[PDB]
Amino acid sequence: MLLEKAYRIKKNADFQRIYKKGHSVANRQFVVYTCNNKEIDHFRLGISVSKKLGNAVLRNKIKRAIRENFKVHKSHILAKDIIVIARQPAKDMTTLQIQNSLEHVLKIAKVFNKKIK
């Protein structure tokens, strides 16, 4: 009795949804798009970056550091379309900062039942 990719995004509609009427934010160099504060049953996790960021190593760190966080916050995120896009200057960030990004942008997304300290 578990969930599937339901809490994932591999389509366009799933990516357009949030971008549709979803409520996107942005900290400093990271933005998170979400929809329906709580009208789903799986936190549609998604990953997006910019084309100005820099190299693939930049579009990766922003991903990895993210794929490393959401992993722990996996059981901290609730259903309500959740995504994290890299502004552009987030390239300067690292697996240390990139993670410290969700500590805000994400904290704003509202994809946290409360947000542990």
Side-chain angles (χ1 to χ4, degrees):
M1 194 88 80
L2 56 272
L3 118 156
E4 219 183 315
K5 63 179 100 128
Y7 63 179
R8 220 100 152 277
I9 297 185
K10 272 246 189 204
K11 271 258 122 109
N12 58 85
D14 284 51
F15 257 140
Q16 144 156 91
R17 259 249 100 80
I18 33 255
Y19 274 42
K20 205 274 227 234
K21 238 105 128 234
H23 171 106
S24 53
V25 307
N27 45 6
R28 52 188 90 186
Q29 310 110 228
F30 215 30
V31 331
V32 290
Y33 277 54
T34 71
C35 169
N36 268 306
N37 301 65
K38 212 187 245 84
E39 227 198 287
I40 13 276
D41 213 345
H42 19 249
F43 38 89
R44 318 204 250 202
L45 221 176
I47 282 142
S48 281
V49 91
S50 200
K51 69 223 182 180
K52 253 154 164 191
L53 223 109
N55 226 42
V57 82
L58 297 178
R59 85 184 253 193
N60 244 308
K61 216 114 264 168
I62 281 142
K63 291 180 177 209
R64 336 215 88 199
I66 258 80
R67 258 262 274 285
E68 238 280 271
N69 215 233
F70 266 139
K71 217 119 159 80
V72 315
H73 307 265
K74 173 266 278 150
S75 216
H76 315 221
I77 273 59
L78 21 299
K80 48 149 290 123
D81 333 49
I82 155 274
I83 316 180
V84 306
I85 346 313
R87 269 287 284 277
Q88 142 172 226
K91 48 126 192 151
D92 82 72
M93 306 181 334
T94 48
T95 267
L96 192 270
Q97 318 192 31
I98 302 145
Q99 304 181 300
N100 263 313
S101 304
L102 315 103
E103 258 227 323
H104 171 143
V105 78
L106 129 54
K107 136 185 145 122
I108 304 210
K110 202 114 251 226
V111 303
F112 269 141
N113 300 291
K114 254 249 205 191
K115 204 230 77 191
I116 270 208
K117 242 271 186 97

